[PDB]
Symmetry: C4
Subunit: 388 residues, 4 copies
């Protein structure tokens, strides 16, 4: 085998077509299915798998009550082939309440994180074995992407943070090269608060549209140069803007340079990608809550400040139901590296209160230069038939 | 590996012998088994798998109530090795309420279809990755075979339709060549309404005995020439005729040229194949309802109008119980390409009303030049022990 | 790969050591486990698997009531790796109420039998695909071994019968050579009623200690010469004698030539093997019922009429609980072909009546030249905790 | 493939980072999970698996009542990939109430033990097939490690005992070389009662920190020279001392030469390893009960009598909950052979009495030269939500 060096032009996509869905919640009312959160999908050259931080339990387990909590010593990273639900036969690849896996092209790398918020650790399991580790620097919930890291020629770069939800955090980018961290670079550029990045190969570099829990609705962008370990950062030019909550199309702004300070203290993991001066992106159809999810093309959104010229939209999840976290994921084509996204459909506590558990099912569309109709693929679980 | 080029003489079969059965419904009253419909089986050179459009749920899930509906955003294409039921560990290969998979001889192709009836899309997932897509042309339930497409030297041909259940539809045949649609040809020949075809390799071409929901009981035939992308069509010569409902042996007819207009607005996916001037075929033992299923050889049925000279019959499913959809499937032998069929044994709503769910189990016999007894292999599930 | 030609001296065993056990019944009261019967184990060069004719249902399924019946259209041949129970994820390799599988050394052969007792068929699935078939000759429950057939250089020989439980049957031996039956030879020798043979390689031939439901307690022996397709037959010389029911050690006899007519109309699948003039063998500890199971070495038992000189006995299953069918199975060693056996531990109806189901779990010891203690490994399921 | 010859310098570890956890008990209240005990993990060059002696049942099976008993004919050795719970789809690799598996570098070896305490046997299944066996020598619960044996160049050494819990036992070390026992050597050195050893490669030899149920809290050490089949033994120099029960840090002692006779009649499987004159080790945080588990580095602990100079400690399992057995396990790195440990988290009868079952879940950290925070990863199962 050789390493993934991703040297192929990004495909010229026309929009998004359907790819996977697992009905996990639907099945949960009639099968021993896990109770996960903050999911994502990644693929090795031959096939894809779906990741998710389970709650160390099943929906029918009374151990589901209080599944809202974000970090318990029992959150383990599950890993199935893309399309097969998290049934008792699922492998818990490692202990972690926050993660990121990528496949250098020879084996898998799994940034797994557990422990006290104040003082947590991060295990770097590569090729099944624990190659290195690192500990909490700012002694405050050392976290990472909750999406897949990316590798180019042997080095895989994961951007992690440790600092303060709504406040100045110490974000840095590790260059774990085959399990062992070969270098660490503090965040450069303008960005004011990088959280849970959605990264993707941009030969010869890596680009990340992230989050910003501090004071921006417009998405942060963290560019890592693979050549010299450098870093740069900014924000998306898009005027539409995509985080949640956010202001609203008419009254939202961004200048690619600073946090817009428009309902900013807030967030949800999102994604996006350039293409010429344009920006393929997607956000919740709702601007206050995580309901529904749309995607569209903002002509100019990449290179021109506050552009609100939208186009090619699509309802992935109708507005009348829940959405959630969202990341990106690439797949090498025979001629070009395609772009794909997934959607976390969360159900349970806080929003819906009939139940005492909080799990989620996924949905994944993929770039396509072909044609396509219209639809809305929600979770589908009747909360009234659900356990608890 | 090389591609399947199917250049082998079709075996000279004597009848049909037993091959698989999964008791899915039987097991459903005592196990987390899925709730599928419109099943089929296909095989790559080494082994076979069984497909089925599940209802994004299990029989015990209250989410089973109303499983009668044909298309919900939750229907995903399941895929197991031939013989292992759709238990929670089954992979949902893609989102689709209508499909067709084939294996060019190097990897699998999966025509998956979801979305609004009015405007649906069709994803062409090949080798795990989404290679292309196409959208609804007549803006009316873009559908396909619900059986396996066939490939010769690299090009795989699936015939799809989009138009009007009982009325003129726009049927066309795509030539997806390794995920990407390399050509599309509108239906030629006489045929008046091709629906859910059962196709099979007929080196150097592909032949399809399909359905006809408009005005025929006799089965349509769609021949695709692989050489020039052409098309031709007609109807089976058989006087016995095999759709449902249909008239009845004595009073049924066909002339290989036009819809017989004998209870025609009606249908069920069926299959058949030539052999000299003869026609191996199978239909429900009942001519009004889908109960039971028989097979036999009509001497002349292929090349001579309205032939009712039957022979070599066999009861696969006794008349006293349910049958359903049915397709064909080929398997390369060491010297000849064998012919095989499967039977959808449906249970649940509308017909049986004790329950509120509608699932099905399969049965599959395969051509054989050997000897064989007689039997009847139904579903076997006691509807009185069944959930709901 | 090459074929198994078994040219190695049989190991010089000292007795039997433990190998597998699946606790299937025990697990059945707390898991979706199948309801099988007439089990057996076989191995391909690399590993072993365990076979069993399930009842097309689980113990918790109400579909378990009446699982006593021997042949229903729903009995399918299950196949797991040696040691993993028949859980919903088990593959139903084919439809069959009587079978025999062997592995020529390149792929598997599965003699599967279903259909009407009067007129049943026998599918010969080889390398996943149906290669041939044969139909019922004496129009009376065409059956076979319920153990593994054996192959030498490409030809695999299964001995089947069709005739009359307690009466003259037409037993014959097929020489299915890679799926296709290359020859059939009627039973020769003295034997008066061969039923469900336990066969084993005896380079360059195959030997079978079978059953005799007609008028013998002493076991039949069917030798097949691979060289010329011939056959020969007789009975074991052993005076101890091992079928059930049988007379009793003191008053039991045999002369290697004729049925002893000592409680003969009766049977249970058993096994045994030579070694010089001696005979390794095993029978139920009880001589009327199937309770318990023992093994021992009869010095002379092979070559000398009515020898009752026993030695090296062992209680595999203590007398206070159920046993059942039993077959043999070989395994190639690095220097010699080892001999192994398995024991069907049946539970359920007729004998135990608290329940309405009849399933079984297995136990398997294997030859050993080493040392070993003593024990008793029964089923272990508390019938009072069991479903129904 | 080649054999594992382990010729690499042991890594220079800084402490322990998280690796796996299976939440088995947590899942048991909502899934068909097995009821095991005395677990362990081992890895072949490519990946790891987790072993455990199940109780031939599930927690929901009424067959769980009385799962406290240590040896029943139904205890079978389960084997899953590291991270996937013991769900019905788990393979019972053999019959055994005491075991040890290792992988010579070409295939697996499984020392499985069952039978009467008085007269038990030990099957040596290698490469799937039973290669040899041995019987009970002192006719008293022939037992072994309950951890993984180790192999160097083709010979795998397991140290077994048979004798008297609290009294002089006959411990010996077998040198099973590819299934067949090529030599046996009685225990040499000073050690007074070796029980369930935790062994590890120390090129060109093997070292074992074991137990001592007789009259020591300080751990026994059994060194096996691979070169000449010799043996040597002693006790750890550490003054901290790690068994349970034990005296207490201030008042505990050891001189590397004799049993300390400090609460000695007692035990629990533990582990430890040298590093220069130092000793990496771990024990329960409690000195009377098995609650909690800690690890630390005793500077000098290896080469200097009664050293109590501790350092680098860590709470793996907080003191407020249960721990249990513990073994070691090695993993070859790209440059050095890393050291790892696992912790048996037991739940059920005797200690906790709300329930009638006694199962356990595991936790596994692995050596690391990196950094790491602090945490406590217990079982997590709310005994009040648990079955029975
Ligand atoms: C491909 O296919 C699309 C499908 O797009 C998406 O449509 C779904 C529904 O919106 C969405 O959830 C799914 O995920 C698809 O991706 C084709 O067009 C689209 O489909 C429908 C119908 O054309 C549009 O749906 C809207 O939402 C309501 C529910 O479906 C519907 O009621 C809305 O219509 C109201 O306005 C119409 C005129 O537009 C009017 O006739 C009615 O009055 C109607 O009723 C409301 O209005 C009144 C009060 O305000 C009262 O009558 C009554 O109380 C009621 O509340 C609306 O139609 C969807 O927006 C539409 N267009 C698009 C661009 O998606 C599309 O043909 C094709 N396009 C592409 C690019 O492939
Ligand atoms: C191989 O084996 C076949 C098996 O073929 C199929 O038979 C099953 C039953 O029909 C079918 O479900 C299964 O799937 C097999 O594939 C051998 O022959 C066949 O088997 C039976 C018996 O010979 C035939 O079955 C028919 O269906 C009824 C249920 O089994 C049965 O009652 C029918 O018989 C009535 O007529 C007979 C004479 O034919 C007469 O003796 C009785 O009176 C009987 O009773 C009814 O009639 C009266 C009122 O009308 C009253 O007595 C009473 O009220 C009752 O209702 C009939 O026998 C099946 O048709 C038959 N033939 C064939 C060609 O399949 C076959 O030997 C062999 N063939 C081949 C090609 O391999
Ligand atoms: C290896 O290990 C064997 C184990 O062999 C098998 O023993 C188990 C029990 O029989 C069997 O189920 C398991 O599968 C093993 O494979 C060692 O020896 C064997 O073990 C026991 C004890 O030595 C023998 O068991 C017999 O069965 C009864 C239950 O265990 C037991 O009660 C019987 O003993 C009666 O007789 C003894 C003297 O023999 C006497 O002291 C008592 O009185 C006892 O009690 C009954 O008798 C009276 C009324 O008749 C009353 O006292 C009271 O009411 C009660 O009913 C008997 O001991 C087993 O037979 C024995 N021998 C053998 C050769 O297996 C063996 O050491 C070693 N051998 C080898 C070849 O490896
Ligand atoms: C990396 O991160 C460690 C984490 O180490 C371990 O800490 C967990 C809790 O002990 C453990 O279960 C987990 O597995 C970790 O591996 C960082 O430091 C450690 O964390 C905490 C806080 O610093 C320490 O925990 C102790 O245990 C109690 C529960 O957490 C806590 O209440 C204890 O504190 C009592 O003393 C403090 C001063 O120490 C005082 O402020 C309070 O009064 C407090 O309250 C009790 O005392 C009074 C009565 O006696 C009353 O106030 C009241 O009734 C109450 O009972 C204590 O803090 C843990 O020991 C600590 N240190 C270490 C070295 O682990 C560490 O920063 C970093 N280290 C490394 C090497 O990476
Ligand atoms: C990126 O990876 C590809 C695959 O390793 C490299 O291209 C291959 O190697 C040589 C030199 O380019 C050619 O003969 C092959 O035909 C190439 N493979 C294919 C599929 O075209 C490529 O050089 C790598 N490096 C860069 C910088 O792109
Ligand atoms: C159809 O496929 C077969 C397999 O690729 C082709 O035949 C093989 O290739 C060469 C030329 O025919 C022969 O030496 C081999 O012996 C053939 N294989 C076998 C199993 O016979 C065949 O040419 C393909 N093309 C056509 C048009 O049939
Ligand atoms: C039985 O099978 C074995 C394996 O195919 C044959 O022996 C091998 O082939 C040649 C000729 O004997 C030797 O160089 C190899 O060393 C043999 N293999 C082994 C493992 O010894 C053997 O000839 C076959 N035929 C017969 C009649 O025994
Ligand atoms: C231990 O095992 C290794 C692997 O088999 C042996 O080293 C390899 O073999 C030759 C001779 O040493 C070298 O060319 C290879 O480069 C070695 N492999 C690696 C990865 O370095 C080694 O000799 C074995 N024996 C001993 C005593 O260490
Ligand atoms: C470790 C962890 O709590 N991850 C999260 C997951 C979801 C959410 C969320 O609110 O959906 C938040 C966090 N935490 C943060 O991002 C804090 O800035
Ligand atoms: C997509 C879809 O509804 N497929 C079907 C499946 C079964 C049936 C059926 O009636 O069994 C019908 C359809 N639809 C049509 O064929 C309409 O002409
Ligand atoms: C097909 C079938 O019934 N197999 C059997 C299995 C078990 C038994 C049994 O009685 O255990 C009997 C049979 N049948 C016969 O052997 C009749 O001679
Ligand atoms: C075979 C067996 O009983 N193994 C054990 C497991 C656990 C324990 C235990 O007490 O945790 C004890 C034993 N037995 C012994 O070690 C006797 O010295
Ligand atoms: Ca924000
Ligand atoms: Ca019609
Ligand atoms: Ca008899
Ligand atoms: Ca002790």
């Amino acid at each position: 085998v050789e390493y993934r060096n991703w040297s192929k032009p990004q495909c010229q996509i026309t929009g998004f077509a359907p790819f996977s869905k697992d009905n996990s919640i639907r099945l949960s009312a009639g099968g021993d299915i896990w109770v996960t959160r903050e999911p994502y999908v990644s693929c090795d050259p031959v096939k894809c798998y779906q990741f998710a931080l389970g709650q160390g339990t099943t929906l029918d387990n009374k151990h589901s009550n209080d599944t809202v909590h974000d970090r318990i010593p029992h959150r383990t990273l599950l890993m199935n082939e893309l399309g097969v639900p998290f049934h008792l036969g699922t492998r818990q690849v490692c202990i972690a309440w926050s993660s990121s896996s990528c496949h250098d092209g020879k084996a898998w790398l799994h940034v797994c994180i557990t422990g006290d918020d104040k003082n947590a650790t991060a295990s770097f399991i590569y090729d099944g074995r624990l190659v290195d580790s690192i500990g909490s620097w700012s002694q405050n919930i050392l976290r990472t992407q909750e999406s897949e890291c990316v590798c180019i020629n042997g080095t895989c770069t994961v951007v992690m943070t440790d600092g303060s939800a709504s406040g100045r955090a110490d974000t840095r980018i590790l260059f774990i090269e085959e399990g062992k961290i070969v270098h660490i670079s503090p965040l450069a550029g303008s960005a004011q608060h990088v959280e849970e990045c959605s990264c993707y190969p941009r030969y010869p570099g890596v680009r990340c549209i992230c989050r910003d829990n501090w004071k921006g609705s417009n998405r942060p962008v963290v560019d890592i140069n693979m050549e010299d370990y450098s870093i740069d950062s900014s924000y998306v030019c898009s005027g539409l803007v995509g985080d949640t909550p956010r202001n609203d199309d008419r009254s939202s702004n961004s200048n690619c340079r600073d946090p817009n300070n428009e309902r900013g203290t807030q967030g949800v993991k999102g994604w996006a990608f350039d293409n010429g001066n344009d920006l393929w992106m997607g956000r919740t159809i709702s601007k206050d809550l995580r309901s529904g999810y749309e995607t569209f093309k903002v002509i100019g959104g990449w290179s021109t400040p506050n552009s609100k010229s939208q186009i090619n939209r699509q309802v992935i999840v109708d507005s009348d139901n829940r959405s959630g976290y969202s990341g990106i994921f690439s797949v090498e084509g025979k001629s070009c590296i395609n772009r794909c996204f997934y959607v976390e459909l969360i159900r349970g506590r806080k929003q819906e209160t009939r139940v005492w558990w909080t799990s989620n099912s996924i949905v994944v569309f993929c770039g396509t230069s072909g044609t396509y109709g219209t639809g809305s693929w929600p979770d589908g679980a009747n909360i009234n038939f659900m356990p608890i």
